[PDB]
Amino acid sequence: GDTRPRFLWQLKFECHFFNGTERVRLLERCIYNQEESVRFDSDVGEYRAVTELGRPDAEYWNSQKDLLEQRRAAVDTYCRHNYGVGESFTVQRRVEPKVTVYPSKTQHHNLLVCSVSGFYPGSIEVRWFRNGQEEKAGVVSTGLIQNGDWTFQTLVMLETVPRSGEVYTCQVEHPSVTSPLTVEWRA
Amino acid sequence: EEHVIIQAEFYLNPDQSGEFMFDFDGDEIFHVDMAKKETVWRLEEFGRFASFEAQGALANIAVDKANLEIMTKRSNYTPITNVPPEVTVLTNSPVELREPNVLICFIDKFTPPVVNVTWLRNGKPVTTGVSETVFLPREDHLFRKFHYLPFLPSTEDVYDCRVEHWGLDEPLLKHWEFDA
């Protein structure tokens, strides 16, 4: 079979944006196998070795001012530039979540499920309300799930002791809509 | 923090695998097909609003390989430690009988970036309709990957996402069947 050892090398240039494009931080990192060896943090302004394996590079690269200049100005020519290139279909991408409420196939007490799927961006807020007032306890989330296709999904449960007439509401706030989406369960 | 765009690339010996891609908040914007030497967008639409000179990625890949050889040498040829993937199978949306849906096989937190994935419908391999993504980066420097299988839910059918990776002592079969 195949038992030969593998040797991996990764290079990652991460552009971190804060408040639109107000503050930008470029983080250039080299990873040998599963270990970062050298990096360039725009906040630092020069290459710094992360492990001894990376010392030669940090030292050699910093000795080249031309290289340093390009890297320092990359927060503009690279980061800010690429941000603008795809802002319309990324930063501004919005797909409304599909929301439904049904009791779980498990569970006295009744476990309610608020399924929220196919939405984008990932930042989202879903809360449960019993008769118009936030439910703090009992709530349990599956967490935010990234589907890999510019889509997210999540399930937020609410254990309850239902009484005829109660109205359990699942509320979902998302950038795709101005006012919050609400789906009600009538006990 | 608000947004993160990542240009992630790697070269792997001795599989001589190479990859070059852009990431936006965890979602792939595009990767370069090393063979056809062209940009392949994650969603057809992106290609109508932006472009990338794919050929340029290859120049970076050449340098990456040489750098790998250099690092391989100064580490005294220290091979990478295999790390087995976590595998999860979920649906694209709440499942309902005979209502078109999609099985997502999440292959997460693993390295090196080489994996064999196969979908199984009642013990047999499925090809029609399936798609997959390239290897995606992780903060811990391991990888994530998605495989997809469009399907027609039924009570009978039992699926499996069969995953092979050097970190696994044996093929991992993640079972999925209608339970609603």
């Binding site: 240039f13 590079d57 530039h81 290139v85 | 970076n60």
Partner: peptide, 13 residues
């Protein structure tokens, strides 16, 4: 609009 890439630097020899 065109996406631009950061070039990979050669390691110290």
């Amino acid at each position: 609009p065109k996406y631009v890439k950061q070039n990979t630097l050669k390691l110290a020899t």
